[PDB]
Structure formats: structure tokens, C-alpha cells
């Protein structure tokens, strides 16, 4: 099961996305997206993309079909066959990514928070819960 849900209340500084899930034993990669529209080709304010196949975690945004400049977090705090907890925290200047007990990365806004409309979680991931606070 992939997660996809609209955000009718929008997201402001202090919005927290909590993702609890599991990386499958033969997983390659999964993703967390904050989209600015409802259909697949919409702009992405955030594309959070742990890649176990290439051993990296890529951050990026997407506008008018074009991926912006990639960012990467320090190491890979995900492991095949192991559960995880990710917090995506919105502030005025960006998104704070929290993995496990550690501040993992800070992704500064490319698109204004007011444009975020949808959260999507999918790929090689099994989900326990996806919550917006
Ligand atoms: C168009 C393309 O293949 N781009 C390459 C990157 O792969 C894409 O990365 C974006 C995020 O930036 C998405 O994760 C998308 O699903 C990927 O296909 C790739 O990460 C980089 C590595 O240097 O090369 C791009 O050319």
C-alpha cells in the first residue's frame, strides 16, 4: 500500500509529517513527496528519496516537469528488513528531516509552503502509519 492524501488545511510552520514504516528485505528505494497538485506530474515542494540500491538519500524539488538541484543527507539511516521513523518538519525556512533519534537533514524551501497540497508515500516501503500533525 502506497499513501496519498490531500491537505485541505494546507501546511504551515509547525506542521509535522510522521512516517512509520518498514524497508522490505529486497527493497531498492522508496519516497516521500509533498506535491503542489493532485495528479502525478504536479510540482514537488519536497521529494525525499532514500535509495538502498545506490546507498544514498536524495532530496529535491520539481517544477514544471524539471527536477531542481539534488541534495543528499549524511549516510543512509535506512536498512533493508528494518523499520524506521521519519519526521518531516515544516518551518519558515525549510523542511527538517528527522530519522530515528537524529536530525538528519535540513531542506530549504524552493517552493512556498502555501503551494503544498498533497502528501504521497510510496515505492519499496511497507507502511505502519502516516500522520500529519
Ligand atoms: C532524469 C534523471 O534520470 N535524473 C537523474 C537522477 O535520478 C532522478 O532523481 C530524481 C531526484 O532528483 C528522482 O529521484 C527521480 O526518480 C530519479 O530518476 C539521479 O539521482 C542523478 C544522479 O546524479 O542523475 C540525474 O540525471
UniProtKB/Swiss-Prot annotation:
Mainly expressed in stratified squamous epithelium. It is found in: Cytoplasm; Nucleus; Secreted. A beta-D-galactoside binds at residues 67-73. Pfam families: Gal-bind_lectin (PF00337). GO terms for molecular function: carbohydrate binding. Induction: By p53/TP53. One of its GO terms (biological process) is apoptotic process. GO terms for cellular component: cytoplasm; extracellular exosome; extracellular space; nucleus. It comes from the Eukaryota. Residues 3-133 form the Galectin domain. Monomer. Could be involved in cell-cell and/or cell-matrix interactions necessary for normal growth control. Pro-apoptotic protein that functions intracellularly upstream of JNK activation and cytochrome c release. This is Galectin-7. It comes from Homo sapiens.
Amino acid at each position: 500500500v502506497p499513501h496519498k492524501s490531500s491537505l485541505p488545511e494546507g501546511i504551515r510552520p509547525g506542521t509535522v509529517l510522521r512516517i512509520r514504516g518498514l524497508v522490505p528485505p529486497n527493497a531498492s528505494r522508496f519516497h516521500v513527496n509533498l506535491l503542489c497538485g493532485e495528479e502525478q506530474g504536479s510540482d514537488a515542494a519536497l521529494h525525499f528519496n532514500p535509495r538502498l540500491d545506490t546507498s544514498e538519500v536524495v532530496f529535491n524539488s520539481k517544477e514544471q516537469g524539471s527536477w531542481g538541484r539534488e541534495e543528499r543527507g549524511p549516510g543512509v539511516p535506512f536498512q533493508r528488513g528494518q523499520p524506521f521513523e521519519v519526521l518531516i518538519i515544516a518551518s519558515d525556512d525549510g523542511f527538517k528531516a528527522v530519522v530515528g533519534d537524529a536530525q538528519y537533514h535540513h531542506f530549504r524551501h524552493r517552493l512556498p509552503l502555501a503551494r503544498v497540497r498533497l502528501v504521497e508515500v510510496g515505492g519499496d516501503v511497507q507502511l505502519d502509519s502516516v500522520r500529519i500533525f
